Symmetry: D2
C-alpha cells in the first residue's frame, strides 16, 4: 500500500521568482495516496510542510558539496554570504544538525523521501477534516522506512531511530527559518 519504490520515484522525478514550489506539488502528487486526499487537506499539508520539506531537500543536496548550502536553482551559498545577510547562526544549524548528520550516516534518497513523506503526512496540521487518514498514511511510510532500513542496513539496528531523530531538529530549524532565513539580499537594484 506504500511502496519504497514509489517514494524513491517521487524524489528522482523532481531531481522573483518564484515559483518552483511547483516542484513540491509535483513531488507530493507522486507520493502514494496523497492525491486521493481532499483538495483542501492537500493544500493544508503543503502549506504546513513546505518549509521543512525544502530544508530537508536542500540539506540533502548539500551532502555532495563543500562547506555551505547547494540551493534549488543551482546556487551554491557559502557561510560568509549567510553571516552577511544576518542569518549565520541558522545556516550553522543547517550545516551541523542536518547537513553534517546526513553526510556522516550516508543517508540515501529513499530515506530522504520517506522522512519528507512523514513530514508531509502530518496529522497535527490544523484544519484537517480527517486527521486519522493522514495519521494512517504517516504510519505506512514509517513502516516502509523501518523495513527498508532493516533490509539495506542490516548491521545498523539504530538507523531507523537515527533517521526519525533528525525530525525534531528539522522542525526547530524550520520555525527559525520562517522567523528569519532564505534570501536575495543581493538587491542591489540601485536606482540612483
Amino acid at each position: 500500500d506504500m511502496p519504497v519504490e514509489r517514494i524513491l520515484e517521487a524524489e528522482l522525478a523532481v531531481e522573483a521568482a518564484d515559483k518552483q514550489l511547483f516542484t513540491l506539488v509535483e513531488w507530493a502528487k507522486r507520493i502514494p495516496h496523497f492525491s486521493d486526499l481532499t483538495l483542501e487537506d492537500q493544500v493544508i499539508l503543503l502549506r504546513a510542510g513546505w518549509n521543512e520539506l525544502l530544508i530537508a531537500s536542500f540539506s540533502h543536496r548539500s551532502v555532495s558539496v563543500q562547506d555551505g548550502i547547494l540551493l534549488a536553482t543551482g546556487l551554491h551559498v557559502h557561510r560568509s554570504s549567510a553571516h552577511s545577510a544576518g542569518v549565520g547562526s541558522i545556516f550553522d544549524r543547517v550545516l551541523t544538525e542536518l547537513v553534517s548528520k546526513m553526510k556522516d550516516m550516508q543517508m540515501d534518497k529513499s530515506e530522504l523521501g520517506c522522512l519528507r513523506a512523514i513530514v508531509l503526512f502530518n496529522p497535527d496540521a490544523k484544519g484537517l477534516s480527517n486527521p486519522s487518514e493522514v495519521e494512517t498514511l504517516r504510519e505506512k511510510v514509517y513502516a516502509t522506512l523501518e523495513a527498508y532500513t532493516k533490509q539495506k542496513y542490516p548491521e545498523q539496528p539504530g538507523r531507523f531511530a537515527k533517521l526519525l531523530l533528525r525530525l525534531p531538529a528539522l522542525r526547530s530549524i524550520g520555525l527559525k527559518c520562517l522567523e528569519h532565513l532564505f534570501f536575495f539580499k543581493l538587491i542591489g537594484d540601485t536606482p540612483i
Copy 2:
C-alpha cells in the same frame, strides 16, 4: 537648507503579482533635500532600515481619505474582516486606532507627513552607517523645519509639534509587528491537477 516646500514636493511627486514599490520609495528619497549627497552605501542602509515604517506611514495617511479600512498603493482597499479572517486583525486594528484615527483627528497634512517620513528616513541609529553624524544632523534639520512650519501654519496649536513626534514610537512599534509578514495577498491558487 531643509525647506518644507521641497519635502512637500517629494510627497506630491510620488502622490502619485510581485509589484512591490521600492521605485516610488527611492523616487521619494531622492527628492528629499541632502539625501543623495550621502555615501551611496549609507542611503541603502537608510532605505532598508526605514522601508517598512515609511510604507506604513504612507498608507495610513492616504487611509484618512476613507470611511473605514486601509488603502494600499495598488488601489487595494482592505477592511477589518478581510484581516481578521486572514489572522492579522490585531495589527490591522492597531494601524487604525494608533495611526489612521490620529492623523485624521489632527487633520495632519502632506508637509507634516513628509517631515515625519523624512525623520524616520534620517535615522542615526541605523546599523552600519559610516557617518551617523551626517544623518543625525539632517534629522535635526527636518524637525527644526517641521517645528517652524507648525508655528507658521497652526499658531493656535502649541503642542502640535510634540503631538506629531509622539506618533513615531507607535509607528516603530507597528513596523516591527508588521514583520509578521502583513502581505495581504497570500497565494493559494493551485493546480494541483496534471501529470
Copy 3:
C-alpha cells in the same frame, strides 16, 4: 548500560510562587551515566532541555483529568482560563498534540522517562565539549525504549516510532512556549 528499571526509578522518585523545579536536577541525577558527564555539560543539557522536560512531564501528569493541565503543585488549569489569558493557541497544542496522544496510546511512566532521557541527552546542544558521548547515551536510551516497547506491547509494532514522533511536536511546543506561559499572574499590583 541503560536499564529501563533505573529510568523508571528516576520517574518514580520525583513524583506568590517561586523555585521548586529542583525535581529536574533530582530526576537527571538518577538517569544512568548523566552524572558521569562533565559538570559544565550537565548544566548545558539541563538548560537546553528544562522547557521540553517540564512540558513532557506535566502533559503526562494531565492524562487523567477533564480537558486541562495539572502542575505538580496541584495547580490545575482548564482550557477556558488559558484562552482567556491569550495563550489558548499553545495550550490547545499541548492538549491535542501531547496530552490526548499520551492518553490514547496509554503512554506509561517508563516510556515517558525514556522520552525525557532522549530529550535530556541532546548532542545538538550548543557548547558541548563532547556531543559524541551525549550521542552514545542517546543511542543507549532509545535502544532500551525500543526493546521495552517490543517486550510489553508486542501487538503494536509501530509504538516505538509513534513515541519518537511526539518529539518534533514537543520541540515545536517548547519553542512556542518561550513566547511565554508560566504559573499565571495575576496583576494584584497593590
Copy 4:
C-alpha cells in the same frame, strides 16, 4: 497641574531571591501628578504596558554615572562580557549606543528623564483603557512642562525638546527586544555534587 518639581520628586523618592524590587515603579507612579486620579483598572493597564520601557529608561540613565556597563537598582554592574555570554549581547549594544551614550552626550538630566518616563507612563494607545482621552491630556501636560523646562534650563539648545522625544522610538523598540528575553539571568552555579 503638572509641575517638573513634582515629577523630579517622584524620581528621587524611589531612587531613594528574587525581587522585584519593582515596588519602586508603583511608588514612582503614585507620585506622578494625577496618576492616582485615574480608575484603578486604568492604573494597572498603564503600568503593565509601560513597565519594561520605564525600567530600561531608569537603568539607562543610572548608567550615565558609570564608565560603560549597566548599573541596576541594587548595585549589579553588568558588563558587556557577562551579557555577551547570557545570549543578550546585541541588545546590550543597543542599550549602550541608542540610549546610554546619547544620554551621556546630551547630559540628559533627572527632570528630563522623569518627564520622558511620565510620557511613557501616560500611553493613550494602551490596550483596554476606559478613558483614553484623559490619559492623552495627562501626557500633553507632561510634554508642555518638559518643553517649558527645556527652554528655561537650556537656552542655547533650541532642538533639545525634540531630541528627548526622539529617543522614545528607540526605547519602544529596545523595550520589545527586552520583553522577549533580557533582564533575566543567569546561573551556572546550580551544578550539584549534592
